[PDB]
Amino acid sequence: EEKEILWNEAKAFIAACYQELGKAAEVKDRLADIKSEIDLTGSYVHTKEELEHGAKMAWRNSNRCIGRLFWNSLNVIDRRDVRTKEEVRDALFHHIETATNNGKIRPTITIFPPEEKGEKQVEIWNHQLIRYAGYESDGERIGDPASCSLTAACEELGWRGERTDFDLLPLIFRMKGDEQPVWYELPRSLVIEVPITHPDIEAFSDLELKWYGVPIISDMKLEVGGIHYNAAPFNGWYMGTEIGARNLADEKRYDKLKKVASVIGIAADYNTDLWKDQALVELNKAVLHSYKKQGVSIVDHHTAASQFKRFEEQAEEAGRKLTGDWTWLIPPISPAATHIFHRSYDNSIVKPNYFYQDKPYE
Amino acid sequence: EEKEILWNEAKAFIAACYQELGKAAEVKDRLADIKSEIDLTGSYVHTKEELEHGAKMAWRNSNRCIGRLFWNSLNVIDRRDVRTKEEVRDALFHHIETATNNGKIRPTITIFPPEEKGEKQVEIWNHQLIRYAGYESDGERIGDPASCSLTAACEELGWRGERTDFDLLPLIFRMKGDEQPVWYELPRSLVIEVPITHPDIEAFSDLELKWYGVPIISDMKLEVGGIHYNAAPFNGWYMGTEIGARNLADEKRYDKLKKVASVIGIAADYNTDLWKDQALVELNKAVLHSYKKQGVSIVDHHTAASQFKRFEEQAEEAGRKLTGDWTWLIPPISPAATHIFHRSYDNSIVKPNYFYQDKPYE
Ligand code: HEM
Ligand code: HEM
Ligand SMILES: Cc1cc(N)nc(CCc2cncc(CCc3cc(C)nc(N)c3)c2)c1
Ligand SMILES: Cc1cc(N)nc(CCc2cncc(CCc3cc(C)nc(N)c3)c2)c1
Ligand SMILES: C[C@H](O)[C@H](O)[C@H]1CNc2nc(N)[nH]c(=O)c2N1
Ligand SMILES: C[C@H](O)[C@H](O)[C@H]1CNc2nc(N)[nH]c(=O)c2N1
Ligand SMILES: [Cl-]
Ligand SMILES: [Cl-]
């Protein structure tokens, strides 16, 4: 039953992948080899080209990603050879280091062994390799509320945070065979952080805001040709809105708009003053300014939308059918100022692709 | 064939309408009367209660409307008795006058005779009873580009605009039997306009911006129980974003962001400065300020979203299933600051409702 699914997804992937690579003739043989490998081993193994390209195709088919223009420049690290929790840990450390690149962020994915019989070889508990801890107890909210579950789950296993608003969560993952996951404290020399300051408002530094430079997603499954790489952390650079309009602005997150309104010298009393809208912009101006001033890669939503437009154009020219999720593609600040707002997108799911998978804890 | 459709939509509407009104017992008889009326006349006629309520239900089911909270306070004018183009003209004049109410805008709908055999008795060419003319010739763009087709169609019939950026388009509609539509110049004493000024920036008045106070939609069909009221102009007040983030901001409209950026003293050179986002807010602050300062009703998107939330709550409490269009419900400025952004809506179409119908010209 399962070997039928795997076989059909393999035929589809190889025939398409080799067509884009220009190896349409090599399809016939590679198919037969796969047919035997699935017949005997129950699962086939990707070549380095198939894996590297399949990961690039997956990014290209991420309907909710606005930065898909550079899908073909994805730096792919093949760590399907790891067996010990030290190799995995070091691989995670390396990914952070190489992807950060002193600030010149490289879109990188590290690929660990896939699910064998649906059985995870590696199980990463982090949603992002670099994230801030969250604490909620006695009506006291500290840090990132979105990380409350993982933080508590980490603290159930002997980890303890300093209870600042920006405690670096440890790398926590579980091996196949192990009943409990292990956790490792993040070497702070590997983590670039950016303090948020305003280009013309010196009082903005009184807010003492900051964020990590590199978003490394580690809660999604890379699916390539029937093979399920559940542990494949990937990263790009930030679109400024993600930090200033969601992470630091949301009431369910850092909730900083009232404090931002105070330091910029506007009242936060009346809706018709649009103080939230005004605070949102200045905060986002501060974020972009701070990242550029530090030398950490970042993109504004207007530039990102322009890049995504070229991606649309590039897609049509290559004969590729375009897919996208309008609700996620539009930026949370001035969405009507982008071309994305004024056109529709097909939200059909095309494989290879990245799929969200629920965490073992909460 | 048709009389089957009309009969089923009549059963559904009357049984539901009379249930909400508390006249569930009167359903049985009224149904039978309708059954005979459709049998003989080919179409039935609504009572004043059924029409008034059906129009309120239609507003309540407008998935793309954020201001549905006050659906039950809709002022319904029943002008199904008009026969001459003077009665229709005066009815249109009256609607404008009563709905404006010196600035205290009343949500009002004027209902003209429905399509008889699918044949329109009245055919309104305006998209809004009050709108600005648009001119495009010799690379010269004047007025509202969205109104270019109608403006040219009006000028084909002897009308001529002064070619300012805010020429009031004439009321233009066609009668059943007439081959051509008639046009009437709008009595300017009936039209409230609001000059746009900034609360703290005196240089904003140098832009010489303004907009009409009342949006009166006249391009949609009111469908109530199988009956098609193609000509039923309705109005509410403005949500500030509609004027400042779409009408005056869009490149395909008035395209004022660069000029707004200049008068507020910011550079319009770099994307990372977020000058578009910053200009958008200040322009929208100016719009809300100008309407409140003049005494013309208006709502900000934050207040509107709060009102729409009560509508959601009211819906659940009444046992009513909620329907909405997320893509239209979110405001084009700071959408993530509203609850609407963080929840989903069923975009199912429930009747009675308002349906868009293409204009006879372009
Ligand atoms: C080059 C820098 C990149 C930028 C600026 C970017 C931008 C974004 C943004 C803004 C989102 C939506 C976040 C939200 O508002 O919720 C997103 C989603 C996503 N991006 Fe990208 N992205 C980048 C690189 C990548 C890379 C390298 C991959 C993987 C190969 C990727 C795959 C995805 C996926 C899978 C999602 C959806 C995640 C989910 O389910 O929520 N992106 N991207
Ligand atoms: C009370 C004041 C009202 C406000 C503030 C309001 C607000 C809005 C807004 C913002 C939109 C979307 C416009 C856009 O962004 O494209 C909308 C759409 C709509 N509203 Fe309302 N509305 C109001 C009253 C009414 C009334 C009185 C009716 C009719 C009974 C109505 C029916 C609709 C319909 C049918 C649409 C969709 C029109 C289309 O197809 O584009 N609304 N409303
Ligand atoms: C590679 C990459 C780059 C970038 N700039 N942003 C992202 C998205 C980051 C991101 C941040 N916060 C939240 C999410 C979504 C979380 C999420 C949660 C659930 C339940 N289902 C989903 N499909 C997704 C994504 C990814
Ligand atoms: C009663 C009412 C109040 C209000 N504040 N806004 C509206 C919507 C006004 C409005 C302005 N510009 C454009 C539109 C949509 C035009 C439109 C165009 C097409 C092709 N299909 C549609 N369904 C709709 C609506 C209606
Ligand atoms: C494709 C997209 O859903 C469509 O163009 C919607 C987007 N949201 C919108 N929002 C508003 N206010 N008005 C519109 O016409 C639209 N159009
Ligand atoms: C219901 C709604 O479509 C859903 O919550 C979407 C809206 N758009 C979004 N946009 C972003 N950036 N992130 C999200 O998680 C969502 N969620
Ligand atoms: Cl993030
Ligand atoms: Cl309008």
mmCIF file with all atom_site columns, N, CA, C and O in Angstrom, chain A residues 271-274 277-278 280 284-285 288 300-303 326-327 330 332-335 341, chain B residues 246 271-274 277-278 280 284-285 288 300-303 326-327 330 332-335:
data_model
loop_
_atom_site.group_PDB
_atom_site.id
_atom_site.type_symbol
_atom_site.label_atom_id
_atom_site.label_alt_id
_atom_site.label_comp_id
_atom_site.label_asym_id
_atom_site.label_entity_id
_atom_site.label_seq_id
_atom_site.pdbx_PDB_ins_code
_atom_site.Cartn_x
_atom_site.Cartn_y
_atom_site.Cartn_z
_atom_site.occupancy
_atom_site.B_iso_or_equiv
_atom_site.pdbx_formal_charge
_atom_site.auth_seq_id
_atom_site.auth_comp_id
_atom_site.auth_asym_id
_atom_site.auth_atom_id
_atom_site.pdbx_PDB_model_num
ATOM 1   N N  . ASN A 1 271 ? -8.399  56.141 18.905 1.00 0.00 ? 271 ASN A N  1
ATOM 2   C CA . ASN A 1 271 ? -8.291  55.345 17.687 1.00 0.00 ? 271 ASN A CA 1
ATOM 3   C C  . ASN A 1 271 ? -8.138  56.215 16.446 1.00 0.00 ? 271 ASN A C  1
ATOM 4   O O  . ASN A 1 271 ? -7.365  55.893 15.543 1.00 0.00 ? 271 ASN A O  1
ATOM 5   N N  . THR A 1 272 ? -8.874  57.321 16.412 1.00 0.00 ? 272 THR A N  1
ATOM 6   C CA . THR A 1 272 ? -8.876  58.213 15.255 1.00 0.00 ? 272 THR A CA 1
ATOM 7   C C  . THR A 1 272 ? -7.546  58.939 15.057 1.00 0.00 ? 272 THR A C  1
ATOM 8   O O  . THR A 1 272 ? -7.322  59.562 14.018 1.00 0.00 ? 272 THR A O  1
ATOM 9   N N  . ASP A 1 273 ? -6.669  58.863 16.052 1.00 0.00 ? 273 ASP A N  1
ATOM 10  C CA . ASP A 1 273 ? -5.326  59.412 15.917 1.00 0.00 ? 273 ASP A CA 1
ATOM 11  C C  . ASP A 1 273 ? -4.426  58.425 15.180 1.00 0.00 ? 273 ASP A C  1
ATOM 12  O O  . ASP A 1 273 ? -3.325  58.778 14.752 1.00 0.00 ? 273 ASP A O  1
ATOM 13  N N  . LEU A 1 274 ? -4.910  57.193 15.041 1.00 0.00 ? 274 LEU A N  1
ATOM 14  C CA . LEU A 1 274 ? -4.174  56.116 14.382 1.00 0.00 ? 274 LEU A CA 1
ATOM 15  C C  . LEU A 1 274 ? -2.796  55.909 15.002 1.00 0.00 ? 274 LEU A C  1
ATOM 16  O O  . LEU A 1 274 ? -1.806  55.737 14.290 1.00 0.00 ? 274 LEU A O  1
ATOM 17  N N  . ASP A 1 277 ? -1.147  52.537 14.148 1.00 0.00 ? 277 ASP A N  1
ATOM 18  C CA . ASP A 1 277 ? -0.636  52.547 12.785 1.00 0.00 ? 277 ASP A CA 1
ATOM 19  C C  . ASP A 1 277 ? 0.657   53.347 12.699 1.00 0.00 ? 277 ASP A C  1
ATOM 20  O O  . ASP A 1 277 ? 1.595   52.957 12.005 1.00 0.00 ? 277 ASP A O  1
ATOM 21  N N  . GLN A 1 278 ? 0.704   54.465 13.417 1.00 0.00 ? 278 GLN A N  1
ATOM 22  C CA . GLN A 1 278 ? 1.874   55.334 13.406 1.00 0.00 ? 278 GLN A CA 1
ATOM 23  C C  . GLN A 1 278 ? 3.043   54.715 14.170 1.00 0.00 ? 278 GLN A C  1
ATOM 24  O O  . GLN A 1 278 ? 4.195   54.830 13.755 1.00 0.00 ? 278 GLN A O  1
ATOM 25  N N  . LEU A 1 280 ? 3.468   51.503 14.590 1.00 0.00 ? 280 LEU A N  1
ATOM 26  C CA . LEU A 1 280 ? 3.867   50.342 13.799 1.00 0.00 ? 280 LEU A CA 1
ATOM 27  C C  . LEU A 1 280 ? 4.916   50.698 12.751 1.00 0.00 ? 280 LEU A C  1
ATOM 28  O O  . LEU A 1 280 ? 5.886   49.965 12.557 1.00 0.00 ? 280 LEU A O  1
ATOM 29  N N  . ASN A 1 284 ? 8.946   49.725 12.702 1.00 0.00 ? 284 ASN A N  1
ATOM 30  C CA . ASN A 1 284 ? 9.458   49.010 11.538 1.00 0.00 ? 284 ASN A CA 1
ATOM 31  C C  . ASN A 1 284 ? 10.579  49.764 10.832 1.00 0.00 ? 284 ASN A C  1
ATOM 32  O O  . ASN A 1 284 ? 11.470  49.153 10.240 1.00 0.00 ? 284 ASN A O  1
ATOM 33  N N  . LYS A 1 285 ? 10.533  51.092 10.898 1.00 0.00 ? 285 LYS A N  1
ATOM 34  C CA . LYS A 1 285 ? 11.626  51.915 10.390 1.00 0.00 ? 285 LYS A CA 1
ATOM 35  C C  . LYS A 1 285 ? 12.861  51.700 11.254 1.00 0.00 ? 285 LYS A C  1
ATOM 36  O O  . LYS A 1 285 ? 13.986  51.685 10.757 1.00 0.00 ? 285 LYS A O  1
ATOM 37  N N  . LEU A 1 288 ? 14.478  48.006 10.447 1.00 0.00 ? 288 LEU A N  1
ATOM 38  C CA . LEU A 1 288 ? 15.239  48.022 9.203  1.00 0.00 ? 288 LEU A CA 1
ATOM 39  C C  . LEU A 1 288 ? 16.528  48.822 9.362  1.00 0.00 ? 288 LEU A C  1
ATOM 40  O O  . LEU A 1 288 ? 17.589  48.410 8.890  1.00 0.00 ? 288 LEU A O  1
ATOM 41  N N  . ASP A 1 300 ? 12.907  44.969 3.300  1.00 0.00 ? 300 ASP A N  1
ATOM 42  C CA . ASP A 1 300 ? 11.634  45.625 3.563  1.00 0.00 ? 300 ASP A CA 1
ATOM 43  C C  . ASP A 1 300 ? 10.567  44.978 2.691  1.00 0.00 ? 300 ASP A C  1
ATOM 44  O O  . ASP A 1 300 ? 10.885  44.321 1.700  1.00 0.00 ? 300 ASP A O  1
ATOM 45  N N  . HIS A 1 301 ? 9.302   45.156 3.057  1.00 0.00 ? 301 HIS A N  1
ATOM 46  C CA . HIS A 1 301 ? 8.214   44.474 2.363  1.00 0.00 ? 301 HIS A CA 1
ATOM 47  C C  . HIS A 1 301 ? 7.981   44.994 0.947  1.00 0.00 ? 301 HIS A C  1
ATOM 48  O O  . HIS A 1 301 ? 7.464   44.273 0.095  1.00 0.00 ? 301 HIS A O  1
ATOM 49  N N  . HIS A 1 302 ? 8.365   46.241 0.693  1.00 0.00 ? 302 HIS A N  1
ATOM 50  C CA . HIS A 1 302 ? 8.211   46.818 -0.639 1.00 0.00 ? 302 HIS A CA 1
ATOM 51  C C  . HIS A 1 302 ? 9.222   46.208 -1.604 1.00 0.00 ? 302 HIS A C  1
ATOM 52  O O  . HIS A 1 302 ? 8.885   45.858 -2.734 1.00 0.00 ? 302 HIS A O  1
ATOM 53  N N  . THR A 1 303 ? 10.465  46.083 -1.148 1.00 0.00 ? 303 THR A N  1
ATOM 54  C CA . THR A 1 303 ? 11.513  45.456 -1.942 1.00 0.00 ? 303 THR A CA 1
ATOM 55  C C  . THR A 1 303 ? 11.204  43.979 -2.148 1.00 0.00 ? 303 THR A C  1
ATOM 56  O O  . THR A 1 303 ? 11.374  43.444 -3.243 1.00 0.00 ? 303 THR A O  1
ATOM 57  N N  . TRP A 1 326 ? -2.529  34.142 -0.949 1.00 0.00 ? 326 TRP A N  1
ATOM 58  C CA . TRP A 1 326 ? -2.727  35.587 -0.862 1.00 0.00 ? 326 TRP A CA 1
ATOM 59  C C  . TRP A 1 326 ? -2.737  36.091 0.579  1.00 0.00 ? 326 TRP A C  1
ATOM 60  O O  . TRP A 1 326 ? -2.163  37.137 0.881  1.00 0.00 ? 326 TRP A O  1
ATOM 61  N N  . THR A 1 327 ? -3.379  35.333 1.462  1.00 0.00 ? 327 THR A N  1
ATOM 62  C CA . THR A 1 327 ? -3.531  35.730 2.858  1.00 0.00 ? 327 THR A CA 1
ATOM 63  C C  . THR A 1 327 ? -2.204  35.815 3.610  1.00 0.00 ? 327 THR A C  1
ATOM 64  O O  . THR A 1 327 ? -2.095  36.519 4.614  1.00 0.00 ? 327 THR A O  1
ATOM 65  N N  . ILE A 1 330 ? 0.569   38.885 1.402  1.00 0.00 ? 330 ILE A N  1
ATOM 66  C CA . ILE A 1 330 ? 0.426   40.308 1.687  1.00 0.00 ? 330 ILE A CA 1
ATOM 67  C C  . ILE A 1 330 ? 1.113   40.679 3.002  1.00 0.00 ? 330 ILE A C  1
ATOM 68  O O  . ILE A 1 330 ? 0.968   39.979 4.005  1.00 0.00 ? 330 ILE A O  1
ATOM 69  N N  . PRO A 1 332 ? 1.801   42.761 6.476  1.00 0.00 ? 332 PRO A N  1
ATOM 70  C CA . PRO A 1 332 ? 0.898   43.276 7.512  1.00 0.00 ? 332 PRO A CA 1
ATOM 71  C C  . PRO A 1 332 ? 0.971   44.793 7.695  1.00 0.00 ? 332 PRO A C  1
ATOM 72  O O  . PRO A 1 332 ? 0.281   45.329 8.560  1.00 0.00 ? 332 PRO A O  1
ATOM 73  N N  . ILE A 1 333 ? 1.803   45.469 6.910  1.00 0.00 ? 333 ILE A N  1
ATOM 74  C CA . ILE A 1 333 ? 1.805   46.930 6.894  1.00 0.00 ? 333 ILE A CA 1
ATOM 75  C C  . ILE A 1 333 ? 1.766   47.461 5.463  1.00 0.00 ? 333 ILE A C  1
ATOM 76  O O  . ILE A 1 333 ? 2.586   47.085 4.625  1.00 0.00 ? 333 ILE A O  1
ATOM 77  N N  . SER A 1 334 ? 0.797   48.334 5.202  1.00 0.00 ? 334 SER A N  1
ATOM 78  C CA . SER A 1 334 ? 0.528   48.851 3.859  1.00 0.00 ? 334 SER A CA 1
ATOM 79  C C  . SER A 1 334 ? 0.446   47.773 2.775  1.00 0.00 ? 334 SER A C  1
ATOM 80  O O  . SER A 1 334 ? 1.173   47.845 1.785  1.00 0.00 ? 334 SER A O  1
ATOM 81  N N  . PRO A 1 335 ? -0.441  46.774 2.948  1.00 0.00 ? 335 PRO A N  1
ATOM 82  C CA . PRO A 1 335 ? -0.510  45.705 1.945  1.00 0.00 ? 335 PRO A CA 1
ATOM 83  C C  . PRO A 1 335 ? -1.012  46.183 0.586  1.00 0.00 ? 335 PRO A C  1
ATOM 84  O O  . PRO A 1 335 ? -0.618  45.619 -0.433 1.00 0.00 ? 335 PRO A O  1
ATOM 85  N N  . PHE A 1 341 ? -1.529  42.579 -3.396 1.00 0.00 ? 341 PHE A N  1
ATOM 86  C CA . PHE A 1 341 ? -2.872  42.898 -2.927 1.00 0.00 ? 341 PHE A CA 1
ATOM 87  C C  . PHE A 1 341 ? -3.874  42.901 -4.076 1.00 0.00 ? 341 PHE A C  1
ATOM 88  O O  . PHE A 1 341 ? -5.010  42.454 -3.923 1.00 0.00 ? 341 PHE A O  1
ATOM 89  N N  . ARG B 1 246 ? -7.040  53.975 -0.433 1.00 0.00 ? 246 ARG B N  1
ATOM 90  C CA . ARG B 1 246 ? -7.444  53.453 -1.734 1.00 0.00 ? 246 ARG B CA 1
ATOM 91  C C  . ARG B 1 246 ? -7.740  54.570 -2.731 1.00 0.00 ? 246 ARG B C  1
ATOM 92  O O  . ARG B 1 246 ? -7.072  54.675 -3.758 1.00 0.00 ? 246 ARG B O  1
ATOM 93  N N  . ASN B 1 271 ? 13.041  52.681 -0.103 1.00 0.00 ? 271 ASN B N  1
ATOM 94  C CA . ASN B 1 271 ? 12.028  51.763 0.406  1.00 0.00 ? 271 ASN B CA 1
ATOM 95  C C  . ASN B 1 271 ? 12.194  51.498 1.897  1.00 0.00 ? 271 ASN B C  1
ATOM 96  O O  . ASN B 1 271 ? 11.212  51.423 2.637  1.00 0.00 ? 271 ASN B O  1
ATOM 97  N N  . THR B 1 272 ? 13.443  51.363 2.333  1.00 0.00 ? 272 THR B N  1
ATOM 98  C CA . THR B 1 272 ? 13.746  51.041 3.725  1.00 0.00 ? 272 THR B CA 1
ATOM 99  C C  . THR B 1 272 ? 13.396  52.172 4.691  1.00 0.00 ? 272 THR B C  1
ATOM 100 O O  . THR B 1 272 ? 13.399  51.980 5.907  1.00 0.00 ? 272 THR B O  1
ATOM 101 N N  . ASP B 1 273 ? 13.099  53.350 4.150  1.00 0.00 ? 273 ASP B N  1
ATOM 102 C CA . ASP B 1 273 ? 12.631  54.459 4.971  1.00 0.00 ? 273 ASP B CA 1
ATOM 103 C C  . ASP B 1 273 ? 11.137  54.319 5.243  1.00 0.00 ? 273 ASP B C  1
ATOM 104 O O  . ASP B 1 273 ? 10.588  55.011 6.101  1.00 0.00 ? 273 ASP B O  1
ATOM 105 N N  . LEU B 1 274 ? 10.496  53.419 4.500  1.00 0.00 ? 274 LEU B N  1
ATOM 106 C CA . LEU B 1 274 ? 9.060   53.170 4.611  1.00 0.00 ? 274 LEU B CA 1
ATOM 107 C C  . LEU B 1 274 ? 8.247   54.448 4.434  1.00 0.00 ? 274 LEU B C  1
ATOM 108 O O  . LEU B 1 274 ? 7.298   54.697 5.178  1.00 0.00 ? 274 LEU B O  1
ATOM 109 N N  . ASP B 1 277 ? 4.519   53.880 3.660  1.00 0.00 ? 277 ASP B N  1
ATOM 110 C CA . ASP B 1 277 ? 3.803   53.478 4.862  1.00 0.00 ? 277 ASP B CA 1
ATOM 111 C C  . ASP B 1 277 ? 3.563   54.675 5.773  1.00 0.00 ? 277 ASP B C  1
ATOM 112 O O  . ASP B 1 277 ? 2.493   54.815 6.362  1.00 0.00 ? 277 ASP B O  1
ATOM 113 N N  . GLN B 1 278 ? 4.564   55.544 5.875  1.00 0.00 ? 278 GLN B N  1
ATOM 114 C CA . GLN B 1 278 ? 4.473   56.721 6.731  1.00 0.00 ? 278 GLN B CA 1
ATOM 115 C C  . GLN B 1 278 ? 3.533   57.772 6.146  1.00 0.00 ? 278 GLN B C  1
ATOM 116 O O  . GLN B 1 278 ? 2.781   58.418 6.875  1.00 0.00 ? 278 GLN B O  1
ATOM 117 N N  . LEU B 1 280 ? 1.058   57.100 4.121  1.00 0.00 ? 280 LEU B N  1
ATOM 118 C CA . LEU B 1 280 ? -0.271  56.498 4.184  1.00 0.00 ? 280 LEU B CA 1
ATOM 119 C C  . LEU B 1 280 ? -0.973  56.800 5.503  1.00 0.00 ? 280 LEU B C  1
ATOM 120 O O  . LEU B 1 280 ? -2.163  57.116 5.525  1.00 0.00 ? 280 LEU B O  1
ATOM 121 N N  . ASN B 1 284 ? -4.178  59.336 6.199  1.00 0.00 ? 284 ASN B N  1
ATOM 122 C CA . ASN B 1 284 ? -5.364  58.774 6.834  1.00 0.00 ? 284 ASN B CA 1
ATOM 123 C C  . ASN B 1 284 ? -5.718  59.475 8.142  1.00 0.00 ? 284 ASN B C  1
ATOM 124 O O  . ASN B 1 284 ? -6.890  59.553 8.514  1.00 0.00 ? 284 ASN B O  1
ATOM 125 N N  . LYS B 1 285 ? -4.703  59.983 8.835  1.00 0.00 ? 285 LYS B N  1
ATOM 126 C CA . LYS B 1 285 ? -4.929  60.803 10.021 1.00 0.00 ? 285 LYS B CA 1
ATOM 127 C C  . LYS B 1 285 ? -5.586  62.113 9.609  1.00 0.00 ? 285 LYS B C  1
ATOM 128 O O  . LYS B 1 285 ? -6.439  62.643 10.319 1.00 0.00 ? 285 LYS B O  1
ATOM 129 N N  . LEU B 1 288 ? -9.515  61.426 8.607  1.00 0.00 ? 288 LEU B N  1
ATOM 130 C CA . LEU B 1 288 ? -10.346 61.277 9.796  1.00 0.00 ? 288 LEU B CA 1
ATOM 131 C C  . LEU B 1 288 ? -10.510 62.611 10.517 1.00 0.00 ? 288 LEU B C  1
ATOM 132 O O  . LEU B 1 288 ? -11.604 62.957 10.963 1.00 0.00 ? 288 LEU B O  1
ATOM 133 N N  . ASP B 1 300 ? -12.909 55.052 11.865 1.00 0.00 ? 300 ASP B N  1
ATOM 134 C CA . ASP B 1 300 ? -11.569 54.524 11.656 1.00 0.00 ? 300 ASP B CA 1
ATOM 135 C C  . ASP B 1 300 ? -11.645 53.003 11.632 1.00 0.00 ? 300 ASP B C  1
ATOM 136 O O  . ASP B 1 300 ? -12.617 52.420 12.111 1.00 0.00 ? 300 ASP B O  1
ATOM 137 N N  . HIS B 1 301 ? -10.626 52.360 11.073 1.00 0.00 ? 301 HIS B N  1
ATOM 138 C CA . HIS B 1 301 ? -10.662 50.912 10.888 1.00 0.00 ? 301 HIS B CA 1
ATOM 139 C C  . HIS B 1 301 ? -10.565 50.132 12.197 1.00 0.00 ? 301 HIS B C  1
ATOM 140 O O  . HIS B 1 301 ? -11.028 48.996 12.281 1.00 0.00 ? 301 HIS B O  1
ATOM 141 N N  . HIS B 1 302 ? -9.970  50.741 13.217 1.00 0.00 ? 302 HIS B N  1
ATOM 142 C CA . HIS B 1 302 ? -9.856  50.088 14.518 1.00 0.00 ? 302 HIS B CA 1
ATOM 143 C C  . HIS B 1 302 ? -11.213 50.043 15.212 1.00 0.00 ? 302 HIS B C  1
ATOM 144 O O  . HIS B 1 302 ? -11.601 49.020 15.775 1.00 0.00 ? 302 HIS B O  1
ATOM 145 N N  . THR B 1 303 ? -11.933 51.161 15.166 1.00 0.00 ? 303 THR B N  1
ATOM 146 C CA . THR B 1 303 ? -13.274 51.233 15.731 1.00 0.00 ? 303 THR B CA 1
ATOM 147 C C  . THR B 1 303 ? -14.220 50.329 14.953 1.00 0.00 ? 303 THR B C  1
ATOM 148 O O  . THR B 1 303 ? -15.044 49.624 15.536 1.00 0.00 ? 303 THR B O  1
ATOM 149 N N  . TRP B 1 326 ? -12.567 37.271 4.296  1.00 0.00 ? 326 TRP B N  1
ATOM 150 C CA . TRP B 1 326 ? -11.367 37.727 4.994  1.00 0.00 ? 326 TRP B CA 1
ATOM 151 C C  . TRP B 1 326 ? -10.560 38.732 4.178  1.00 0.00 ? 326 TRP B C  1
ATOM 152 O O  . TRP B 1 326 ? -10.061 39.720 4.715  1.00 0.00 ? 326 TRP B O  1
ATOM 153 N N  . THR B 1 327 ? -10.451 38.480 2.877  1.00 0.00 ? 327 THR B N  1
ATOM 154 C CA . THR B 1 327 ? -9.648  39.316 1.990  1.00 0.00 ? 327 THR B CA 1
ATOM 155 C C  . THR B 1 327 ? -10.177 40.744 1.863  1.00 0.00 ? 327 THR B C  1
ATOM 156 O O  . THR B 1 327 ? -9.430  41.663 1.529  1.00 0.00 ? 327 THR B O  1
ATOM 157 N N  . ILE B 1 330 ? -10.314 42.671 6.136  1.00 0.00 ? 330 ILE B N  1
ATOM 158 C CA . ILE B 1 330 ? -9.103  43.271 6.687  1.00 0.00 ? 330 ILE B CA 1
ATOM 159 C C  . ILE B 1 330 ? -8.861  44.662 6.099  1.00 0.00 ? 330 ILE B C  1
ATOM 160 O O  . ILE B 1 330 ? -8.980  44.862 4.889  1.00 0.00 ? 330 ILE B O  1
ATOM 161 N N  . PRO B 1 332 ? -6.723  47.935 4.837  1.00 0.00 ? 332 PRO B N  1
ATOM 162 C CA . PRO B 1 332 ? -5.480  48.064 4.067  1.00 0.00 ? 332 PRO B CA 1
ATOM 163 C C  . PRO B 1 332 ? -4.366  48.799 4.814  1.00 0.00 ? 332 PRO B C  1
ATOM 164 O O  . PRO B 1 332 ? -3.290  48.993 4.252  1.00 0.00 ? 332 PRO B O  1
ATOM 165 N N  . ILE B 1 333 ? -4.621  49.214 6.051  1.00 0.00 ? 333 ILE B N  1
ATOM 166 C CA . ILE B 1 333 ? -3.564  49.762 6.897  1.00 0.00 ? 333 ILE B CA 1
ATOM 167 C C  . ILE B 1 333 ? -3.583  49.119 8.282  1.00 0.00 ? 333 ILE B C  1
ATOM 168 O O  . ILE B 1 333 ? -4.615  49.096 8.954  1.00 0.00 ? 333 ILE B O  1
ATOM 169 N N  . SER B 1 334 ? -2.430  48.597 8.688  1.00 0.00 ? 334 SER B N  1
ATOM 170 C CA . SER B 1 334 ? -2.291  47.832 9.927  1.00 0.00 ? 334 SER B CA 1
ATOM 171 C C  . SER B 1 334 ? -3.352  46.744 10.117 1.00 0.00 ? 334 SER B C  1
ATOM 172 O O  . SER B 1 334 ? -4.045  46.737 11.134 1.00 0.00 ? 334 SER B O  1
ATOM 173 N N  . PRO B 1 335 ? -3.482  45.817 9.148  1.00 0.00 ? 335 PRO B N  1
ATOM 174 C CA . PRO B 1 335 ? -4.520  44.788 9.284  1.00 0.00 ? 335 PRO B CA 1
ATOM 175 C C  . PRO B 1 335 ? -4.270  43.829 10.445 1.00 0.00 ? 335 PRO B C  1
ATOM 176 O O  . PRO B 1 335 ? -5.231  43.321 11.020 1.00 0.00 ? 335 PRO B O  1
#
